[PDB]
Amino acid sequence: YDIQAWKKQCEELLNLIFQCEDSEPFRQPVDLLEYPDYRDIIDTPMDFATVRETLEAGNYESPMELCKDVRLIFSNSKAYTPSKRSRIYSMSLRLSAFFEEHISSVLSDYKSALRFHKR
Ligand SMILES: O=C(NC1CC1)c1cnn2cccnc12
């Protein structure tokens, strides 16, 4: 029923993601000194600190918008990798599976709560 519950649920999920060793490459914006051609490949950089900051600033209206940004972190990694076997891309796939498994109920509860609100 709670149309606002998704926000704390997303904060707690982001805390789990930061505790996860697989999030290490994605915790802060990609360093262009480390990867000089990154912006030649990636149009819209995204990282978990930016997601957390957007959420804490009150700049997400729904968990769907947060999901879109988290999914962009993973699609950027898939686009930048030269190999399906790279260490960082492999970490992104595990972290994506963990994220999708935990965000499913957040989106479901939010959409259900909003449908109840607008009934
Ligand atoms: O997403 C990647 N890098 C960004 C987060 C730092 C990334 C994916 N595969 N890969 C291989 C070598 C170097 N960096 C990568």
Which CATH superfamily does the domain covering 1-119 fall into? Bromodomain-like (1.20.920.10)
Q: To which H or E segment does residue 13 belong?
A: helix 6-19
Q: How far is the centre of ligand 1, averaged over its atoms, from the C-alpha of 52 (Å)?
A: 21
- Angle formed by the axes of helices 6-19 and 63-80, to 10°? 30
The whole-angstrom separation of Cα 64 and Cα 73 is 15
Q: How far is the centre of ligand 1, averaged over its atoms, from the C-alpha of 97 (Å)?
A: 18
Tokens of 62: 């729904």
Unique residue bearing structure tokens 């149309």: 3
Phi-psi bin for 64: left (phi > 0), alpha (psi -120 to 50), beta?
A: alpha
* Experimental method, per PDB record: X-ray
Resolution (A): 1.4
Q: Is 80 in the pocket of ligand 1 (CB under 6 A)?
A: yes
What is the CA 113 to chain-centroid distance, rounded?
Answer: 22
